Design a protein around this ligand. Structure first.
Ligand SMILES: *[C@@H]1O[C@H](CO)[C@@H](O[C@@H]2O[C@H](CO)[C@@H](O[C@@H]3O[C@H](CO)[C@@H](O)[C@H](O)[C@@H]3O)[C@H](O)[C@H]2NC(C)=O)[C@H](O)[C@H]1NC(C)=O
Ligand SMILES: *[C@@H]1O[C@H](CO)[C@@H](O)[C@H](O)[C@H]1NC(C)=O
Lengths: 173, 55
């Protein structure tokens, strides 16, 4: 949406990731793996469930009102009675339409936003030790086994610990 | 009037609400279809609906 990550710079989604909404896929020396990011996944969920509650909140609750179906023709009062209901239904039918179109647009942008935030954050962790391949993947210019990937994923990766190694491979080997 | 259940005469119904401390006074010289008391009035969540739907 407004951001460019979803259906944007991230070519497509992973039909296989069934444990989270947003996630990681790496390929190091030891092999390949996948893991959902529970943190960003819950931010999107919380926000969506938050609007869901607002929307499907608490009901009209009306009792004795006015008649809406008529068996005999009467003119003036009956005319006005019907117009009152008609213009009402019309105004509530617009509200419902618009409300659903606004929310939907926002839900998309918002979920596009949480993707793009996962990216920048992960990007800010890698410091000078990586480059962005432009497809949502970072090329890590240093040996990174599984415990190394895990630290990125869990937010504890220290970039100094691999900087020079990184810098070396990066800048003309 | 057209025959309706034998008859060709009719009866017109009217009503009167008596507020506390006020008095009702029926006064006539014929054709009256007098009352037999009053119905209590309650304000609340009640209403009415037309439907041949099962309950
Ligand atoms: C004014 O005209 C009306 C309209 O024609 C007259 O009403 C008619 O009165 C007769 C009784 O003389 C009604 O007859 C009944 O018909 C039923 C239904 O089939 C039957 O069960 C009985 O055996 C009897 O014959 C007739 O229905 C009724 N017509 C209508 C259309 O309601 C009325 O009598 C006239 N009054 C005067 C004072 O001239
Ligand atoms: C991050 O990764 C390393 C390697 O597996 C581990 O020692 C560290 O404690 C992890 N932190 C969390 C919060 O899981």
């Amino acid at each position: 949406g407004l951001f460019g990550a979803i259906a944007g710079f991230i070519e497509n989604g992973w039909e296989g990731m069934i444990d989270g909404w947003y996630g990681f896929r790496h390929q190091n020396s030891e092999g390949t793996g996948q893991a959902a990011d529970l943190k960003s996944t819950q931010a999107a969920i919380d926000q969506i469930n938050g609007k869901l509650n607002r929307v499907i909140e608490k009901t009209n609750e009306k009792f004795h009102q006015i008649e809406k179906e008529f068996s005999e023709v009467e003119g003036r009062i009956q005319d006005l009675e019907k117009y009152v209901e008609d213009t009402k239904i019309d105004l509530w039918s617009y509200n419902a339409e618009l409300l659903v179109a606004l929310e939907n647009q926002h839900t998309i942008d918002l979920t596009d936003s949480e993707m793009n935030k996962l990216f920048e954050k992960t990007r800010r962790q890698l410091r000078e030790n990586a480059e962005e391949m432009g497809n949502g993947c970072f090329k890590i210019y240093h040996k990174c086994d599984n415990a190394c990937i895990e630290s990125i994923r869990n937010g504890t990766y220290d970039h100094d610990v691999y900087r020079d190694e990184a810098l070396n491979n990066r800048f003309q080997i | 009037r057209p025959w309706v259940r034998g008859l060709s005469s009719r009866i017109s119904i009217y009503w009167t609400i008596v507020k506390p401390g006020d008095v009702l006074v029926i006064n006539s010289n014929g054709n009256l279809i007098a009352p037999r008391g009053y119905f209590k009035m309650r304000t609340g969540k009640s209403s009415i609906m037309r439907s041949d739907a099962p309950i």
